[PDB]
Design an enzyme around this catalytic site. Structure first.
Site: not given
Lengths: 125, 280, 49, 253, 160, 66, 125, 140, 125
Positions: H105-108
């Site tokens: 998930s690049r949205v961490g």
């Protein structure tokens, strides 16, 4: 039924993961608790074989109809070690649990036969 | 039908030059229907139609021991069974280089003989058990299982060059399956057969107590084929031929063989056993 | 006297290995046999006793 | 190329599995090695006096075979592999030195298959220490109780010497017989004490005092120092096992 | 065939033992004591003023330049006195003690543990066990009782 | 005494060492010494193909070799 | 000639099956029989190499013409274990067992001369 | 979407029957652009645009755990992360049978809550070590 | 600039080798010469850590635009050992040898102030 099935699936998963080790190290490099589930999965693998009435030509043996209650009270027993003293090959190519102990008694008898015939061969020569 | 791959290359050539659309591996696509038309004409005809027959043994070449090619899968789909010959085993010594794991027959007992049903049902068990153990480099040289013995001697009997007569095969396999040929060593399993079929030991050394059962006549093939081995009239004479053949071998021949030390004599016995493995 | 290697030739020892058999499954099979024979010997002992 | 791509997929995943299993071998080996490296700091002290007793000049082989009637050899091998050429070189030295009047009682499972197949009659048996617990004085004594079955004249123990983490050479202990050693003791205690070989320690006061000492005590002296020799040999070969396994595992990786 | 590719070292050589000199000079003031259990040492050539040992003949005392002697150690305790007036006591299990004329004492034993790491509590239970083994008439158990009592009696007397 | 009983001086020392390891206090020293006293080893000799226990010298100390 | 060629091909098929182990673990992890078969198949493979009069420019050696009767006896000796003391490298790029034994004598001579040379260099050092 | 692999089979059927030029896996070229017409319509809108949002959970079935496939490569190249389920873990009693290393998930943290950042960061600093330890330990 | 860069690459390669040795044997196994370059390699790796004027507002720390020749003189000093007394952590997240020394002095002053605080906090009580 559901829990026995999912525990057997998880066990055969570990069984694969342990052929992946036994192929490399050996059985001696595993704990007794691991050898236990190795034997149990190897016994479920051999027990899930079954002769069919259609295969009378090829197998040369009569097929067996296995009822659900007998098909659950034998997997759960082999899953919780209720039958670990019974040998391995007694599970190979049979039906219910009653056939198992029959086959194991048979193999004990035909082993004692070869033992005493070896003894009498040693006595004769 | 010698190689059908060359008939599929020819059908591809035909169709592509006639400007049919290609398909998988450049074949037109209906080469399955082609070989289906060819091979479903094989049948065992009804008694209404004379009880006639035509057997078919098509042959297909293989590349690098794969069973994944198009025509190979299309023909395995059609044909009943298959005799898979492995180059790893041809190169590894054994001839015919049959791979039993990949070669089966979808008819079974109903085709073969009453005398062959009872032997094949024992050999299937024996080879299924030997398949599980034969991976072990033999350590328990004396602790070897009887299956580890019989299987290896049976592979020796499988080593041939030419065809073997039915009577000349059963009487050789009965000794294996019943363990009479266990004291001899592996390498003399075919010279054994040679003496069993062409040099009657009890007939030579005078130990003739059997009334009829001898391998010289060659017309006992049909009585074996009809009555079967597990019959009252044929079982005891069979055992009182094979146990004497084994004892005479173990006494006169095995000893002389094991007494050979020279290189000339060992090469001569070598070439003798290879010749026996070919002709027998 | 060096080594009595098994071979096809008669002077060499008997080779009971099979190329078709797989070495990978051999250890599990060995353990299976060694356990099965113990279980059979114990069942024989229980029946005799 | 379906079968081919699946073949290479299978080989690839099999090697990705086998790699991490070998890394597991490596990590377990280091877990058992760091416990033993503590010995390296506390090394080379237990036979510092014992050499002065059991050491002699480097005697030739062709003379001792004529002097003796039944020699003895003890190669110390391992119970599990991935070690290297230790066992194999230990066999190569024995076939290099092989002679009629020898006998072999080895240690470890790996000399079981080898010795019986290469040395048919001289090899008799072996000893097997499952390495869940360290080796004991009673274990070396149990080895002495096996060796005492033979009327051996000279027992050449063979093992591997951990010179460093990168060097695990061979090493030997040439043990004379008790009844020959007592006579050599008296013979050397009589004459003046001159070292007959460079690097050897003089032991004349020792060979007098032991001559003064009684019978049972000198018997126990011999058995004791031989037990310590055996135990130190096994310990050094254990350290060499755990030092060579890491090399024979990283090369496999 | 290769003429003897291998040439294994003599493992005795790696050690550095004493050189027993008959003595053309004076004696040192303190003994160089080295004590070893099975493989690992506990003391490597440490300066020591005096040491008292237990033997089958009895109990002996060792000082600098003591007469060259070797004898059995009886299974009991051991007392070591360093130059600083302190003391250190060690339970042992037999062994042999070699005293050099130069003043270098090499002791080899099968076990060495201080008295501090032993309690009279756990020792007490084993006493009557050894007595029961001694009184139980059996050649396999009587000797075991006698030996366990042989090791417990110096311990029972030393803790007290 | 134990001398003519048939046991060795080395078995005697090991019995003494076992007793010391029993009576001594629980700790790291005992953790080291249970290794130097526990018996787990065996002996085997190779038959024509099989393994067999050379039971002429037992590992346990109460018995006597014969 | 037939039986010898059959046995050579079988030995090399076994050497090929053992390559999958030798490439991974090593010769030290093989049974004594297995590593003997390896040490003999390697000798066969090195003996199969030979120089030709055409490739004299490359191997730097004159080309040999092996007669059939002398081709069969050499393989038979290398197959029956009649020549195992000879090392592996004496078979590389030669023709005829006489040429083998010559090359092995040459290499033994050179190795001994190197040992006396290093002895003299050590004494002078 | 359950699922897009069948949508792509249907687009293949359409394009081949209408004689569009094929490409890898017999798909046309613009099937990446086909799925980009769809997934890019997911968005987190602006406070000038009502601040509404469309999230997407496209499902794509693999075969023999292949990820080098064209469609899988494309959707991974398009999506803002991934979840990867495994049958070797589904069978081993691990359900949901994720593979946390391949799952990304690049949205961490910007999505996570205040109470969630600490928790998930501790589980990351626990599992990254749990694998280095569990992988090296034996089975026993 | 080339010889310095190739020497740093050699250094870091040797440092990777010695780190693979330390994880097996231990740092105490290494000689005095090896641990010196293991120190200098650690110093280099920590000195590569640089701040950023982009993230100067985010993280708070300043950014450093360091020239080329000054950087080469810095790495040449750190390679010739004429700046070794500086600790490892001082090189963490800095730029330039002329700038790190202020942080090193700040660290030394901080540790001296903590010592002067602890001594008097213990002496007052």
């Amino acid at each position: 039924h559901y829990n026995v099935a999912m525990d057997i699936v998880e066990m055969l998963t570990k069984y694969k993961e342990l052929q992946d080790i036994i192929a490399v190290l050996g059985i001696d490099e595993l704990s007794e608790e691991d050898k236990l589930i190795v034997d149990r999965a190897r016994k479920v693998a051999k027990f899930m074989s079954q002769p069919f009435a259609v295969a009378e030509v090829f197998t040369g043996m009569k097929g067996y109809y296995v009822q659900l209650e007998d098909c659950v009270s034998d997997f759960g027993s082999l899953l919780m070690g209720q039958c670990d003293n019974i040998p391995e090959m007694a599970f190979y190519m049979v039906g219910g649990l009653d056939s198992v102990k029959e086959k194991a008694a048979k193999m004990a008898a035909e082993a004692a036969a070869m033992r005493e015939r070896a003894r009498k061969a040693a006595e004769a020569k | 039908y010698d190689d059908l791959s060359k008939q599929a290359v020819s059908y591809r050539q035909i169709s592509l030059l006639l400007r049919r659309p290609p398909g998988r591996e450049a074949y037109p696509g209906d080469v399955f229907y082609l070989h289906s038309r060819l091979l479903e004409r094989s049948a065992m005809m009804s008694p209404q139609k004379g009880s006639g027959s035509l057997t078919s043994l098509p042959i297909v070449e293989t590349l690098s021991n794969d069973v994944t090619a198009y025509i190979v899968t299309n023909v395995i789909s059609i044909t009943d069974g298959q005799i898979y010959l492995d180059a790893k085993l041809f190169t590894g010594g054994q001839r015919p280089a049959v791979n039993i794991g990949l070669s089966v027959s979808r008819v079974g007992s109903s085709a073969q003989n009453k005398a062959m049903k009872k032997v094949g049902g024992a050999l299937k068990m024996l080879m299924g058990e030997y398949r599980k153990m034969a991976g072990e480099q033999t350590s328990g040289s004396q602790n070897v299982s009887p299956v580890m013995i019989r299987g290896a001697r049976c592979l020796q009997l499988f080593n041939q060059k030419g065809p073997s007569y039915f009577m000349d095969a059963i009487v050789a396999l009965y000794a294996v399956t019943n363990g009479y040929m266990d004291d001899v060593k592996l390498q003399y399993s075919k010279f054994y057969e040679f003496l069993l079929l062409n040099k009657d030991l009890p007939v030579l050394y005078g130990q003739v107590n059997n009334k009829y059962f001898y391998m010289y006549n060659k017309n006992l093939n049909y009585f074996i084929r009809y009555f079967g081995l597990n019959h009252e009239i044929l079982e005891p004479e069979l055992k009182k031929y094979i146990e004497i053949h084994t004892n005479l071998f173990l006494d006169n021949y095995q000893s002389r063989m094991n007494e050979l030390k020279s290189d000339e004599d060992l090469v001569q016995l070598k070439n003798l056993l290879y010749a026996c493995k070919r002709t027998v | 006297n060096k080594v009595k290697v098994p071979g096809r030739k008669p002077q060499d020892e008997e080779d009971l290995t099979w190329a078709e058999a797989d070495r990978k499954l051999t250890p599990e099979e060995r353990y299976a046999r060694d356990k099965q024979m113990a279980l059979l010997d114990k069942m024989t002992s229980q029946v005799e006793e | 190329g379906g079968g081919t791509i699946r073949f290479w997929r299978e080989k690839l995943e099999g090697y990705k599995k086998y790699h991490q299993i070998v890394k597991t071998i490596k990590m377990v080996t280091l877990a058992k090695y760091r416990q033993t490296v503590v010995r390296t700091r506390v090394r080379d002290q237990t036979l510092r006096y014992t050499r002065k007793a059991l050491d002699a000049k480097t005697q030739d082989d062709q003379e001792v075979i004529e002097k003796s009637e039944c020699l003895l050899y003890v190669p110390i091998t391992t119970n599990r592999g991935s070690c290297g050429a230790l066992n194999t070189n230990m066999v190569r030295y024995l076939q290099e030195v092989e002679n009629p009047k020898m006998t072999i009682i080895s240690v470890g499972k790996k000399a079981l298959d080898a010795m019986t197949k290469v040395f048919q009659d001289t090899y008799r048996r072996t000893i097997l220490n499952d390495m869940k617990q360290a080796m004991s004085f009673q274990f070396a004594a149990y080895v002495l109780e096996h060796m005492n079955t033979v009327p051996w004249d000279r027992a050449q123990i063979v093992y591997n010497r951990y010179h460093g983490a990168a060097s695990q050479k061979l090493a030997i202990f040439n043990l004379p017989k008790f009844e020959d050693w007592k006579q050599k003791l008296e013979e050397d205690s009589a004459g003046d004490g001159k070292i007959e070989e460079d690097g050897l320690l003089q032991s004349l006061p020792m060979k007098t005092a032991l001559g003064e000492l009684e019978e049972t005590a000198v018997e126990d002296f011999y058995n004791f120092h031989s037990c310590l020799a055996v135990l130190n040999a096994v310990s050094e070969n254990e350290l060499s096992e755990y030092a060579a396994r890491i090399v024979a595992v990283e090369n496999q990786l | 065939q290769d003429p003897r590719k291998f040439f294994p070292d003599n493992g005795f050589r790696f050690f550095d033992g004493p050189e027993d000199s008959f003595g053309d000079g004076n004696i040192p003031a303190q003994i160089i004591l080295t004590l070893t259990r099975q493989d690992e040492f506990i003391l490597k050539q440490e300066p020591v003023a005096a040491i008292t040992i237990r033997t089958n003949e009895g109990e002996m005392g060792v000082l600098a330049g003591h007469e060259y002697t070797v004898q059995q150690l009886a299974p009991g305790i051991l007392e070591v006195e360093y130059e600083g007036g302190k003391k250190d006591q060690y339970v042992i299990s037999g062994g042999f003690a070699h005293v050099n004329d130069t003043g270098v004492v090499d002791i080899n034993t099968v076990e060495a543990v201080p008295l501090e790491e032993i309690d009279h509590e756990k020792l007490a239970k084993a006493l009557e066990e050894a007595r029961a083994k001694s009184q139980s008439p059996d050649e396999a158990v009587r000797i075991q009782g006698e030996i366990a009592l042989e090791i417990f009696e110096p311990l029972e007397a030393a803790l007290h | 005494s134990w001398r003519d009983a048939g046991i060795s001086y080395l078995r005697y020392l090991s019995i003494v060492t076992r007793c010391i390891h029993e009576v001594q206090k629980e700790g790291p020293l005992l953790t080291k010494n249970v290794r130097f006293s526990t018996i787990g080893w065996k002996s085997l000799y190779l038959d024509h193909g099989a393994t067999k226990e050379y039971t002429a010298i037992p590992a346990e100390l109460e018995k006597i070799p014969e």
